[PDB]
Protein backbone atom coordinates (compact mmCIF):
# COMPACT_ATOMS: atom_id res chain seq x y z
CA UNK A 1 0.00 0.00 0.00
CA UNK A 2 0.89 3.69 -0.08
CA UNK A 3 2.18 4.03 3.49
CA UNK A 4 4.75 1.26 2.95
CA UNK A 5 8.28 2.70 3.16
CA UNK A 6 11.69 1.13 2.37
CA UNK A 7 13.44 -1.39 4.58
CA UNK A 8 16.62 -0.29 6.32
CA UNK A 9 19.60 -1.21 4.18
CA UNK A 10 21.44 -0.58 0.94
CA UNK B 1 24.16 7.83 34.89
CA UNK B 2 23.19 4.24 34.10
CA UNK B 3 20.28 5.45 31.99
CA UNK B 4 22.29 7.64 29.63
CA UNK B 5 25.01 4.94 29.56
CA UNK B 6 22.46 2.44 28.25
CA UNK B 7 21.20 4.98 25.71
CA UNK B 8 24.71 5.66 24.41
CA UNK B 9 25.44 1.93 24.24
CA UNK B 10 22.26 1.04 22.32
CA UNK B 11 22.88 3.77 19.74
CA UNK B 12 26.52 2.79 19.28
CA UNK B 13 25.62 -0.88 18.83
CA UNK B 14 23.00 -0.07 16.18
CA UNK B 15 25.47 2.16 14.34
CA UNK B 16 28.18 -0.51 14.45
CA UNK B 17 25.76 -3.10 13.06
CA UNK B 18 24.85 -0.77 10.19
CA UNK B 19 28.50 0.07 9.44
CA UNK B 20 29.68 -3.52 9.83
CA UNK B 21 32.28 -2.77 12.54
CA UNK B 22 32.55 -6.15 14.25
CA UNK B 23 35.10 -5.01 16.84
CA UNK B 24 32.63 -2.42 18.17
CA UNK B 25 29.74 -4.91 18.05
CA UNK B 26 31.77 -7.37 20.15
CA UNK B 27 32.61 -4.71 22.73
CA UNK B 28 29.15 -3.12 23.06
CA UNK B 29 26.80 -6.07 22.77
CA UNK B 30 25.10 -7.32 25.92
CA UNK B 31 22.44 -9.99 26.40
CA UNK B 32 20.09 -7.10 27.26
CA UNK B 33 20.70 -4.89 24.17
CA UNK B 34 21.17 -7.56 21.48
CA UNK B 35 17.62 -6.87 20.23
CA UNK B 36 17.54 -3.13 21.05
CA UNK B 37 15.70 -0.85 18.64
CA UNK B 38 16.34 2.22 16.49
CA UNK B 39 13.33 3.98 17.99
CA UNK B 40 13.93 7.19 16.03
CA UNK B 41 13.64 5.43 12.67
CA UNK B 42 12.00 2.11 11.71
CA UNK B 43 12.44 0.42 15.14
CA UNK B 44 15.03 -1.90 13.50
CA UNK B 45 17.20 -4.25 15.59
CA UNK B 46 20.96 -4.65 15.09
CA UNK B 47 20.23 -7.81 13.05
CA UNK B 48 17.86 -5.89 10.74
CA UNK B 49 20.66 -3.41 10.07
CA UNK B 50 23.38 -6.03 9.57
CA UNK B 51 21.07 -7.87 7.16
CA UNK B 52 20.02 -4.78 5.22
CA UNK B 53 23.55 -3.36 4.92
CA UNK B 54 25.13 -6.74 3.98
CA UNK B 55 27.38 -7.37 7.00
CA UNK B 56 27.47 -11.20 7.04
CA UNK B 57 29.89 -11.83 9.88
CA UNK B 58 28.29 -9.16 12.11
CA UNK B 59 24.98 -10.83 11.30
CA UNK B 60 26.24 -14.29 12.33
CA UNK B 61 27.92 -12.81 15.41
CA UNK B 62 24.56 -11.33 16.39
CA UNK B 63 22.82 -14.66 15.73
CA UNK B 64 25.43 -16.50 17.83
CA UNK B 65 24.76 -14.11 20.73
CA UNK B 66 20.98 -14.47 20.77
CA UNK B 67 19.62 -12.03 18.22
CA UNK B 68 15.96 -12.69 17.41
CA UNK B 69 15.81 -13.95 13.84
CA UNK B 70 12.06 -13.12 13.76
CA UNK B 71 12.15 -9.64 15.36
CA UNK B 72 9.76 -7.25 13.58
CA UNK B 73 10.41 -3.60 12.81
CA UNK B 74 7.58 -1.05 12.87
CA UNK B 75 6.39 -2.23 9.45
CA UNK B 76 6.41 -5.91 10.40
CA UNK B 77 9.65 -6.68 8.55
CA UNK B 78 11.92 -9.40 9.86
CA UNK B 79 15.64 -9.25 8.92
CA UNK B 80 15.07 -11.68 6.03
CA UNK B 81 12.85 -8.97 4.45
CA UNK B 82 15.78 -6.53 4.57
CA UNK B 83 18.12 -9.04 2.95
CA UNK B 84 15.49 -9.80 0.29
CA UNK B 85 14.88 -6.11 -0.47
CA UNK B 86 18.55 -5.40 -1.17
CA UNK B 87 19.58 -8.76 -2.67
CA UNK B 88 22.01 -9.98 -0.01
CA UNK B 89 22.12 -13.69 -0.88
CA UNK B 90 24.61 -14.85 1.76
CA UNK B 91 22.74 -12.97 4.51
CA UNK B 92 19.45 -14.54 3.49
CA UNK B 93 21.01 -18.02 3.38
CA UNK B 94 22.45 -17.48 6.86
CA UNK B 95 19.11 -16.28 8.24
CA UNK B 96 17.46 -19.38 6.77
CA UNK B 97 20.11 -21.57 8.43
CA UNK B 98 19.15 -19.94 11.74
CA UNK B 99 15.51 -21.04 11.26
CA UNK B 100 13.90 -17.85 10.02
CA UNK B 101 10.40 -18.18 8.60
CA UNK B 102 10.82 -17.96 4.81
CA UNK B 103 7.12 -17.04 4.37
CA UNK B 104 6.96 -14.41 7.15
CA UNK B 105 4.47 -11.59 6.46
CA UNK B 106 4.84 -7.90 7.30
CA UNK B 107 2.06 -5.43 8.17
CA UNK B 108 0.90 -5.37 4.50
CA UNK B 109 1.30 -9.18 4.26
CA UNK B 110 4.39 -8.87 2.04
CA UNK B 111 6.68 -11.91 2.27
CA UNK B 112 10.42 -11.83 1.57
CA UNK B 113 9.58 -13.23 -1.88
CA UNK B 114 7.24 -10.27 -2.52
CA UNK B 115 10.12 -7.99 -1.56
CA UNK B 116 12.77 -9.71 -3.71
CA UNK B 117 10.38 -9.95 -6.66
CA UNK B 118 9.38 -6.28 -6.49
CA UNK B 119 12.97 -5.09 -6.08
CA UNK B 120 14.38 -7.22 -8.92
CA UNK B 121 16.55 -9.55 -6.82
CA UNK B 122 16.61 -12.63 -9.05
CA UNK B 123 19.05 -14.90 -7.19
CA UNK B 124 17.32 -14.06 -3.90
CA UNK B 125 14.00 -15.08 -5.45
CA UNK B 126 15.49 -18.41 -6.52
CA UNK B 127 17.03 -19.00 -3.07
CA UNK B 128 13.74 -18.28 -1.33
CA UNK B 129 11.86 -20.63 -3.66
CA UNK B 130 14.43 -23.38 -3.07
CA UNK B 131 13.69 -23.07 0.67
CA UNK B 132 9.91 -23.30 0.39
CA UNK B 133 8.82 -19.75 -0.33
CA UNK B 134 5.23 -19.89 -1.58
CA UNK B 135 4.77 -17.87 -4.81
CA UNK B 136 0.95 -18.06 -4.53
CA UNK B 137 0.80 -15.86 -1.42
CA UNK B 138 -1.17 -12.63 -1.92
CA UNK B 139 -0.43 -9.50 0.09
CA UNK B 140 -3.19 -7.41 1.69
CA UNK B 141 -3.95 -5.84 -1.73
CA UNK B 142 -4.37 -9.24 -3.41
CA UNK B 143 -1.01 -9.24 -5.22
CA UNK B 144 1.30 -12.24 -5.62
CA UNK B 145 5.07 -11.72 -5.96
CA UNK B 146 4.54 -12.17 -9.73
CA UNK B 147 2.00 -9.32 -9.71
CA UNK B 148 4.74 -7.06 -8.28
CA UNK B 149 7.50 -8.21 -10.67
CA UNK B 150 8.54 -6.07 -13.63
CA UNK B 151 11.79 -7.77 -14.76
CA UNK B 152 11.59 -10.43 -17.48
CA UNK B 153 13.90 -12.81 -15.64
CA UNK B 154 11.96 -12.70 -12.36
CA UNK B 155 8.60 -13.02 -14.12
CA UNK B 156 9.87 -16.15 -15.90
CA UNK B 157 11.22 -17.54 -12.60
CA UNK B 158 7.94 -17.04 -10.74
CA UNK B 159 5.73 -18.28 -13.58
CA UNK B 160 7.75 -21.50 -13.59
CA UNK B 161 7.39 -21.94 -9.83
CA UNK B 162 3.68 -21.32 -9.73
CA UNK B 163 1.06 -24.03 -10.32
Mutate: best of B41, B55, B75, B119, partner A, most A CBs <10 A: B75
Closest approach of B1 to chain A, Cα-based (Å): 31
Closest CA to B87 of B35, B58, B46, B128: B128
**Helical residues (DSSP H) of chain B, grouped into ranges:** 2-19, 22-28, 46-52, 56-64, 79-86, 89-97, 112-119, 122-130, 145-148, 152-161
Cβ contacts (< 8 Å) between A8 and chain B: which residues? 18, 38, 41-42, 44, 48-49, 52-53, 73, 82
The structure was resolved experimentally with X-ray
Q: How many domains does chain B have?
A: 1
Mapping DSSP to helix (H, G, I), strand (E, B) and coil, where does residue B95 land? helix
Count Cβ atoms below 10 Å from residue B95 Cβ, excluding itself. Answer: 28
Cβ of B51 within 8 Å of Cβ of A10? The answer is no
Owning domain of residue B79:
1-163
CA dist A5 → B69, B94, B108, B111 (Å): 21, 25, 11, 15
Cβ of A10 within 8 Å of Cβ of B54? The answer is yes
Closest approach of B2 to chain A, Cα-based (Å): 29
Rounded-to-10 torsion of CA B33, A9, B108, B89: -100
What is the resolution in angstroms?
1.5
Closest CA to B41 of B66, B10, B68: B10
CA dist B40 → B54, B87, B94, B160 (Å): 22, 25, 28, 42
CATH of the domain at B77: 1.25.40.20
- Show which of residues 1-10 on chain A sit within 8 Å of chain B, judged by CB atoms: 1, 4-10
CA dist B37 → B9, B18, B54 (Å): 12, 12, 18
Closest approach of A2 to chain B, Cα-based (Å): 10
Amino acid sequence: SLSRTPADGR
Amino acid sequence: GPGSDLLRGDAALLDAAKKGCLARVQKLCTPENINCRDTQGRNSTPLHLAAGYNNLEVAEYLLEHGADVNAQDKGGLIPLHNAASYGHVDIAALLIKYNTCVNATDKWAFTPLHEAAQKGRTQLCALLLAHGADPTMKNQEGQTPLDLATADDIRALLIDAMP
